Amino acid sequence: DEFMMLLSKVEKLSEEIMEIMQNLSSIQALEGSRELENLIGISCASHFLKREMQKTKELMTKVNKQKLF
Amino acid sequence: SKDLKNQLGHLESELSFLSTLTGINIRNHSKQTEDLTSIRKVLQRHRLSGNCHMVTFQLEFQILEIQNKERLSSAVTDLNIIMEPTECSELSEFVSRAEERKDLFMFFRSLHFFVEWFEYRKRTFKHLKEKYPDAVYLSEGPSSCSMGIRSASRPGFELVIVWRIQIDEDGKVFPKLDLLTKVPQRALELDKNRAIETAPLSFRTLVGLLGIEAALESLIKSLC
Amino acid sequence: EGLALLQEEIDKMVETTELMTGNIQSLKNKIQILASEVEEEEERVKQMHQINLSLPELSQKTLKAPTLQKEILALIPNQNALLKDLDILHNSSQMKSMSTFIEEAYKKLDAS
Amino acid sequence: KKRQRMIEVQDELLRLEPQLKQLQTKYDELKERKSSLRNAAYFLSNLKQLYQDYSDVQAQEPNVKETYDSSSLPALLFKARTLLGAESHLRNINHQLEKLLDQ
Amino acid sequence: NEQEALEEKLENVKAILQAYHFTGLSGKLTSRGVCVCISTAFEGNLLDSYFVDLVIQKPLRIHHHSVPVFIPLEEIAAKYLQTNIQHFLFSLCEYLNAYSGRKYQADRLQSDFAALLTGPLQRNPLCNLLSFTYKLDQSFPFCARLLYKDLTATLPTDVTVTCQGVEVLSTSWEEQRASHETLFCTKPLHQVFASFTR
């Protein structure tokens, strides 16, 4: 259950990680060229992700409350 | 009714048998018929949902069953496939091209081939991580797109080999396993043969002489 | 007369029967010669890698594909402007928590 | 007399042309293999040496800034996908929870 | 009623079993083994099926096979029959679909666009090579040779476009000869004959 003190840090990081990604003017100019996204094999947009970080902050509180394993 | 129950024990003895050899089972298949009066053509649309290994997925399509005793032929008019958002854009072009070619036998043709390769990705990254668990780190689990080769001793220098299976323009399966190099410039300061640059061109011919299993355990034995 | 027609093929055969004696058997003879040395150096590197799952073969075409390392470089222009502002991404303590998060969670789902 | 040089010269070339290419290609099937073996041996003969030379210099300084050549660039872009595309991973584990959603 | 209950799944299991034939090869259990009906298609247009009986014994023996002896069934049989019986039935699909992928090209070339071609199409009982001569009609003859050698795919591997009577002054041969080879390499036959008479 060592993630419940790492995930609450992620929503502090969500700020700190998106800011330092957007503060780097080269991160935001490589997506939009979606041809660059499919070689890597993952998404690279991140401003819409201000709530996907929340979509996981949502369900990661759902993991350990059950802790089904 | 005695045998009316044995009919289910035998026609389901057929269902699993198909799900085993094909690798393709079938769950929901509704049936819909349409007559057109105006030598007489009749159209059917029916939707189907199955699954292969981990791959779950749904097919909705329509057939233009032309009827004539001189021409008993058949065709399809439009398929529409939707799948789960995976990290490989092949599965976004897997739909993007199958709709312009519209045959589903090729669909289930390459999917057997696709998941069969994907399971090589799993079993090898599980076979290396049981034989060399101190030097291999799977970036995204046993289904990761590649593999790290490093230690907690030399972190700034690793080699990541990338397992990338794809499907061509024809509609057939084409994997492609090449090399990437993670290195500090300090190590180039000493490299005098400079084989570190010609590493992918060498690696694309490294699996040639040896195969995947023998080339990679060679590249891990040369690292450690 | 007809010899003008037959004059062309009396040479057509000599062009090829003198072609077989040198081009066929010599190539045959010098294959067991190469296969001798070809076997040898394999053992010299079998000294450095073990001989031997059933991993299958890749076509000539998978290998003739563009080496994806060179393609990553050519794909994005002003790459050297990227690498400078790319160390500081892995560097900062924020990302060190996310990299382990994704792996530390993947590890247990594959067992259960 | 047009018969003899037909059945004898035409079957000559039709019998010896395929036998030839099987030799041109197999002779080149191993020459291209001989090229490869002196390459793979070269590539291993350097990578083993380089790694443990890097080993002896790694021990010269425990912590140190490590400049990257224009060669290590594609790899950092990979290892950073876990950060860059956290969305998909973070959305994929949400549905991995939905494998266990029925529980 | 023990009848009203078994009625729900029998109508559904007898039709989803008939749905495997829509996906590819289906199966009907028999006394001495199982019947496997490999089904082919070339772009939605269904061609002929092929049933390959087989006995569930060791070593596996094919009872009968309706696939042509023209395709290399025996060569792929040995390589893949006893081992990976599932793979045997899929490499077979790669050859059966490839054949019915080519037969549906040339037979549509003859059935439709035959006025353009001077000498008849030259096929192989395997549709393995297609040689054929034909004119863009002023009078502009051509000749070409489709050379299929990858038995798995439906489009060729080597292409020739040598026309008898090419004039050096008219580069329109060259300009069209080049578009004749290239389009034969990436687009089917019946799909380019409709693109150059539109």
UniProtKB/Swiss-Prot annotation, chain A:
Induction, per UniProt: By estrogen.
Coiled-coil regions, chain positions: 1-30
Impact after mutating residue 6 to R: Abolishes dimerization, but not interactions with nuclear receptors
Top-level taxon of the source organism: Eukaryota
Known tissue expression: Widely expressed. Expressed in spleen, thymus, prostate, ovary, small intestine and white blood cells. Highly expressed in testis and colon. Isoform 4 is expressed in platelets, lymphocytes and granulocytes.
Subunit structure: Homodimer; mediated by the coiled coil domain. Isoform 3, but not other isoforms, interacts with the cytoplasmic tail of integrin ITGB3. The relevance of the interaction with ITGB3 is however uncertain, since isoform 3 is mainly nuclear. Interacts with CCNA2 and MTA1. Interacts with NFKB1 NF-kappa-B subunit. Component of the CENPA-CAD complex, composed of CENPI, CENPK, CENPL, CENPO, CENPP, CENPQ, CENPR and CENPS. The CENPA-CAD complex interacts with the CENPA-NAC complex, at least composed of CENPA, CENPC, CENPH, CENPM, CENPN, CENPT and CENPU. Interacts with TASOR.
Domain description: The DD1 domain (also called RepD1 domain) mediates the corepressor function and is essential in the triggering of apoptosis.
The protein's name in its UniProt record: Centromere protein R
Annotated organism of origin: Homo sapiens (Human)
Swiss-Prot record, chain B:
Cell location: Nucleus; Chromosome, Centromere
Keyword field: Centromere, Chromosome, Coiled coil, Nucleus, Phosphoprotein
One Gene Ontology cellular component annotation held by this UniProt entry: nucleoplasm
GO biological process terms on file: CENP-A containing chromatin assembly; chromosome segregation
Cystine bridges: none
The protein's assembly and partners: Component of the CENPA-CAD complex, composed of CENPI, CENPK, CENPL, CENPO, CENPP, CENPQ, CENPR and CENPS. The CENPA-CAD complex interacts with the CENPA-NAC complex, at least composed of CENPA, CENPC, CENPH, CENPM, CENPN, CENPT and CENPU.
Function text: Component of the CENPA-CAD (nucleosome distal) complex, a complex recruited to centromeres which is involved in assembly of kinetochore proteins, mitotic progression and chromosome segregation. May be involved in incorporation of newly synthesized CENPA into centromeres via its interaction with the CENPA-NAC complex.
Family under the similarity heading: Belongs to the CENP-P/CTF19 family.
Stated name of the protein: Centromere protein P
Gene source species: Homo sapiens
Residues of the full protein shown: 53 to 283 of 288
UniProtKB/Swiss-Prot annotation, chain C:
Location of the protein in the cell: Nucleus; Chromosome, Centromere
Modified residues (Phosphoserine): 93
Coiled coil stretches, renumbered: 18-52
Domain of life: Eukaryota
Family: Belongs to the CENP-Q/OKP1 family.
Known function: Component of the CENPA-CAD (nucleosome distal) complex, a complex recruited to centromeres which is involved in assembly of kinetochore proteins, mitotic progression and chromosome segregation. May be involved in incorporation of newly synthesized CENPA into centromeres via its interaction with the CENPA-NAC complex. Plays an important role in chromosome congression and in the recruitment of CENP-O complex (which comprises CENPO, CENPP, CENPQ and CENPU), CENPE and PLK1 to the kinetochores.
Assembly description: Component of the CENPA-CAD complex, composed of CENPI, CENPK, CENPL, CENPO, CENPP, CENPQ, CENPR and CENPS. The CENPA-CAD complex interacts with the CENPA-NAC complex, at least composed of CENPA, CENPC, CENPH, CENPM, CENPN, CENPT and CENPU.
Protein name stated in the entry: Centromere protein Q
Native source organism of the sequence: Homo sapiens (Human)
Gene that produces this protein: CENPQ
UniProtKB/Swiss-Prot annotation, chain E:
Coiled-coil annotated residue ranges, if any: 1-21
One of the GO BP terms on file: chromosome segregation
Keywords, sorted A to Z: Centromere, Chromosome, Coiled coil, Kinetochore, Nucleus, Phosphoprotein
Keyword Acyltransferase in record: no
Keyword Manganese (UniProt): no
GO CC, alphabetical: cytosol; inner kinetochore; Mis6-Sim4 complex; nuclear body; nucleoplasm; nucleus
Subcellular location field: Nucleus; Chromosome, Centromere; Chromosome, Centromere, Kinetochore
Quaternary structure note: Component of the CENPA-CAD complex, composed of CENPI, CENPK, CENPL, CENPO, CENPP, CENPQ, CENPR and CENPS. The CENPA-CAD complex interacts with the CENPA-NAC complex, at least composed of CENPA, CENPC, CENPH, CENPM, CENPN, CENPT and CENPU.
Family: Belongs to the CENP-O/MCM21 family.
Protein purpose: Component of the CENPA-CAD (nucleosome distal) complex, a complex recruited to centromeres which is involved in assembly of kinetochore proteins, mitotic progression and chromosome segregation. May be involved in incorporation of newly synthesized CENPA into centromeres via its interaction with the CENPA-NAC complex. Modulates the kinetochore-bound levels of NDC80 complex.
Protein name stated in the entry: Centromere protein O
Record organism: Homo sapiens (Human)
Record gene name: CENPO
Range within the parent protein: 89 to 289 of 300
